[model samples]
Target: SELRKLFYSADAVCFDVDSTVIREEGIDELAKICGVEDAVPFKAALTERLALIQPSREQVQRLIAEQPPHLTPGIRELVSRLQERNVQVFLISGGFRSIVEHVASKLNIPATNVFANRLKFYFNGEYAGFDETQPTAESGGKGKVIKLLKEKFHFKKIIMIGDGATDMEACPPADAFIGFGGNVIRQQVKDNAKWYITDFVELLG
Candidate 1:
């Protein structure tokens, strides 16, 4: 059986938001709205320095309205399939809480199951720095989150699906890590993944 071994065995499955679930990366879109050039590189080094500029809530709302996130092909159906089979699905992202929450709502996933970076806001609603203490705020943080989730749930088998290096890092804590390239394909991820799929329906098989 060429199918991923973990797919059949997993009781829980975790998904990465950007590229994996949605067609856009939330932070990069916010960076464009805030006029921050090269946001992707900056995000990669976010823990090393405070390089991001906080955009006002209004600004963020406008950007989100103008360019709303789109669900990846077959994602909604995949989630439904998993839920129908009594599998717990989780959205674990390195993106902001607001954006992740929005995605979660659209997907019918509970907000409590979504874990991501929280964007700080002032009393007046100005953008503030992100919460550095969160596990997803830095590189290799996804793995830490997976470890914690395993400790908390004690699932017999867990699987992670994503399209970035961060998702790859979760392999140690996950029973299997499936690379998704439905939106954007990272060579490193493709190279490292044991079971790589380009579409969500591939998992159904």
Candidate 2:
């Protein structure tokens, strides 16, 4: 029966970016990059008008390219534990590569394990644009990325943890979907996930 329930090899742990790992909003950072500070009120108004609607891929990528923050306490230890278990940790996010790459390096994780949208920069390494053609630019993008990893790795039991609707979509494809609310808690996300946790330590034992 446990075999029947086994959905992945005990060697892979996928993580979500944004509120799941970091305390800051990636999209908001992009907004700042686009000099959207002057349009803060308008952006808020737009969000109000389009509740449940996600921001455009271009918009989010721009912000992430600008600069995004890293994870909270205990993340390094958690990642270390997973690594000790020979579990490959992936930092997957709709967030841009620039921010995620920085976080990955800081965590001692390889860039290969970091999957995200690519931010096009000017020749001088300034933010120019992003890869909108990627699956993450569309609805259910997280699922697409997970599915791709599933096919590539051929793992039988994959666990996905995050704190947003994007991470929620991975439930159908992943062995487990654990919603984390250490940063900001959203009822819809908590209600839909199979397990809700507030800290990485809880996942340890």
Candidate 3:
């Protein structure tokens, strides 16, 4: 009953950026920029050694500027449809703030609504590390962010769309969770979602 109500009248919809909204994962791209060829292994070890790697800010900016992320098909249309209905759309990502802000700006999503890890930089502009204080830096972090939003916004209905295990973790706090596989599909997420779709156009219906 609650789930049905949320489906009919969600006030807010949260999206995951990497592999959900964008074509490539930000961290994996970062690894490539840093000369690590295989993104998979680097991503696997990211949580433990990302800080130690200490990639420079210039490196990240350069990569982002040169190789801008590709938007999933119908993303702009989906965002427009939601906004037309006065639904508050937010991006909750484990990606860096710079990349997230860039994507949000392109989609007309408010910068204030973009939540992600902030990369710390030294005075000389070298990367120090990300702010581990943020919940998104760890596993199950997305769920924590959803819970925090629920407490802060008190929206009558909230929905989350993503393609990872972290996104599924938000189900307890979110009224509904939709698994998106437009770009990359994690079997775990696809298996768990109440609603799974490979096309953004499906959301229009």
- For model 2, give the 10-residue run with minimal summed lDDT: 1-10
Could you tell me how far off, in angstroms, the CA of residue 129 lies in candidate 3 after the best superposition?
1.3
Q: What is the C-alpha lDDT of each candidate?
A: 0.82, 0.70, 0.81
Task: Work out the TM-score per prediction.
Answer: 0.90, 0.77, 0.90
Where model 3 places Cα greater than 4 Å from the true spot, the runs are 1-8, 39-49
Local accuracy of candidate 1 as per-residue lDDT tens digits, 78-153:
8988889888889998787878888888878998788998877778878777887888886777788888989998
Q: Tens-digit lDDT track for model 3 on 84-109?
A: 98999999998888888898998999
State in Å the error of residue 34, model 2: 5.0
Spell out the clash pairs found in candidate 1: none
Angstrom error of the Cα, residue 86, model 1: value is 1.5
> How many backbone clashes are present in model 2?
8
Off by over 4 Å in 1: 37-44, 47-52
> CA shift at 49, candidate 3, in angstroms?
4.4
For model 3, what is the alpha-carbon lDDT of residue 34? 81
Q: Backbone collision count in every prediction?
A: 0, 8, 0
| Between candidates 1 and 3, the lDDT winner | 1
Error of 1 at 105 (Å): 0.8
